[PDB]
Design a protein around this ligand. Structure first.
Ligand SMILES: O=C(N[C@H]1CCCNC1)c1n[nH]cc1NC(=O)c1c(F)cccc1F
Length: 272
C-alpha cells in the first residue's frame, strides 16, 4: 500500500496476514491486516472502546482489503508462555478479565459478537491495558459447545464461554480444553463438565450435531479443575462455563460479581 512501509510480519492465519507497518505521512506505527463485508467492516469503525483494538482505517483497493489498526506490542498468548514458570499474578489476571468483560459488555450491548476469542488475539500494552482484536466476522480450544453442536444462530454467550476458558488458562497455566478436532474438543468438555443432558441444558438433545450415542461422563469438581483459584473466582468461572447459553452469565452481570470487589489495575512487566 503506497502509504505504508512494512516493518515485519507479526501475524498470520486464516484469512489475512498482519504486519507491523509505518504510515508515511503521519509517522504512525500501525498493525496492517491484508485480506456485505465492506458494510460490516465499516460498522467496526464505529465500535470504539478502550478495550477494543482501535480500527484506524479501512483501505479498499485493487481487490485487496487492508485494515489499519493501532499497534500493540504484546499478545496474551506470548505473555502467558513467557509467564509459565511463575504464572501471571492473580491481581493481573483479575484486571485483564475485568477489562475484557468491559470490552465484551460494550460489543454485546451493540449486538456485536466476537465469535473467536483466544489468547493470541488479546493484545496488551505497558499501561496494563488489554484489548479485543480480530473481531470475528489452538483453533478450537475456546469454542463454545453450542457452536460445536451445530447451532447456527448462536448468541453473545459464545464469547463469555471463550473468555472463561482463557481465565482458567491464565490461572492454571495449561489450556482448559485443548481439543485437536471437533469431536475431541466436545469430548474434552464433556469429560470435565459432564456430558450435557436435558436436565442441565434444555434442548441440547435436539441440536444438529448432538448424538444419543455420545458417551456419558460425570462432571468433575471445579476445585479439581482450577486450583488454587479462590471460591469467588471458581464461582464466576462456573457461571461463565454453564452449558445452557441462556443460563451462562452475561458480561454485564459478570462485572458485578464479588470476584471483582478488590479489582485493581497492575502493570505487567514486558520485555520490549
Ligand atoms: O498483532 C499485533 N501485535 C503483535 C505484536 C507482537 C506480539 N504479538 C502481537 C497487533 N497490534 N495491533 C493489532 C494487532 N493485531 C491484530 O489486530 C490481529 C490479531 F491480533 C489477530 C489476528 C488478526 C489481526 F489483525
Amino acid at each position: 500500500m503506497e502509504n505504508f512501509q512494512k516493518v515485519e510480519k507479526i501475524g498470520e492465519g486464516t484469512y489475512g496476514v498482519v504486519y507491523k507497518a509505518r504510515n508515511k505521512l503521519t509517522g504512525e506505527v500501525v498493525a496492517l491486516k491484508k485480506i456485505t463485508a465492506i458494510r460490516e467492516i465499516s460498522l467496526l469503525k464505529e465500535l470504539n472502546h478502550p478495550n477494543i483494538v482501535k480500527l484506524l482505517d479501512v483501505i479498499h483497493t485493487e481487490n485487496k482489503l487492508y485494515l489499519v489498526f493501532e499497534f500493540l506490542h504484546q499478545d496474551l498468548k506470548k505473555f502467558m508462555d513467557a509467564s509459565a514458570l511463575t504464572g501471571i499474578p492473580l491481581p493481573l489476571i483479575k484486571s485483564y478479565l475485568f477489562q475484557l468483560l468491559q470490552g465484551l459488555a460494550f460489543c454485546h450491548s451493540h449486538r456485536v459478537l466476537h465469535r473467536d476469542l483466544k489468547p493470541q488475539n488479546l493484545l496488551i500494552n505497558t499501561e496494563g491495558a488489554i484489548k479485543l482484536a480480530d473481531f470475528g466476522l489452538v483453533t478450537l480450544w475456546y469454542r463454545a459447545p453450542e457452536i460445536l453442536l451445530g447451532c447456527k444462530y448462536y448468541s453473545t454467550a459464545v464469547d463469555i464461554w471463550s473468555l472463561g476458558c482463557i481465565f482458567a488458562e491464565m490461572v492454571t497455566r495449561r489450556a482448559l480444553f485443548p481439543g485437536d478436532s471437533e469431536i475431541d474438543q466436545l469430548f474434552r468438555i464433556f469429560r470435565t463438565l459432564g456430558t450435557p443432558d436435558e436436565v442441565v441444558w434444555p434442548g441440547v438433545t435436539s441440536m444438529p450435531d448432538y448424538k444419543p450415542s455420545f458417551p456419558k461422563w460425570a462432571r468433575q469438581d471445579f476445585s479439581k479443575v482450577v486450583p488454587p483459584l479462590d471460591e469467588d473466582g471458581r464461582s464466576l468461572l462456573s457461571q461463565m462455563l454453564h452449558y445452557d447459553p441462556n443460563k451462562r452469565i452475561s458480561a454485564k452481570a459478570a462485572l458485578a460479581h464479588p470476584f471483582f470487589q478488590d479489582v485493581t489495575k497492575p502493570v505487567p512487566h514486558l520485555r520490549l
